[PDB]
């Protein structure tokens, strides 16, 4: 929130010129237990909480959900056909909030 009387001009986060600057991982495959609630940080980013198209994009993020260091053995990647299913929930809550 902005009003810090410390500068000029003190900008907020919640500007949608600002960029989000979230993380955009996907759920771990055995912490998927508690990553399960990353759903959760919809709230704490309002900015993309509007995001119609990530659903229509998520298709093609469905590779890029996983590390990329960690996608070149396909290992992980693969692995997240389970979580995936967790994963999209994210997704889901954004549309409706």
Same mark, same amino acid.
């Given at each position: ?28 495959? !055995?912490?998927?237990?508690?990553? $399960?609630? #990353? +759903?959760?940080?919809?709230? @704490?980013?309002? %900015?993309? /909480? ?23 053995? !396909?290992?992980?990647?693969?692995? $997240?056909? #389970? +979580?995936?299913?967790?994963? @999209?929930?994210? %997704?889901? /809550?954004?549309?409706?909030?």
């Amino acid at each position: 929130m902005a009003g810090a009387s410390d500068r000029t001009g003190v900008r907020r986060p919640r500007k949608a010129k600002k960029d989000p600057n979230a993380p955009k991982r996907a759920l771990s495959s !055995y912490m998927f237990f508690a990553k $399960e609630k #990353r +759903v959760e940080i919809i709230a @704490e980013n309002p %900015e993309i /909480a509007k995001d119609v198209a990530a659903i229509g994009k998520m298709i093609g993020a469905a590779w890029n959900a996983l590390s990329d260091e960690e996608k070149k053995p !396909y290992e992980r990647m693969s692995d $997240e056909d #389970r +979580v995936r299913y967790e994963r @999209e929930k994210a %997704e889901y /809550a954004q549309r409706k909030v």
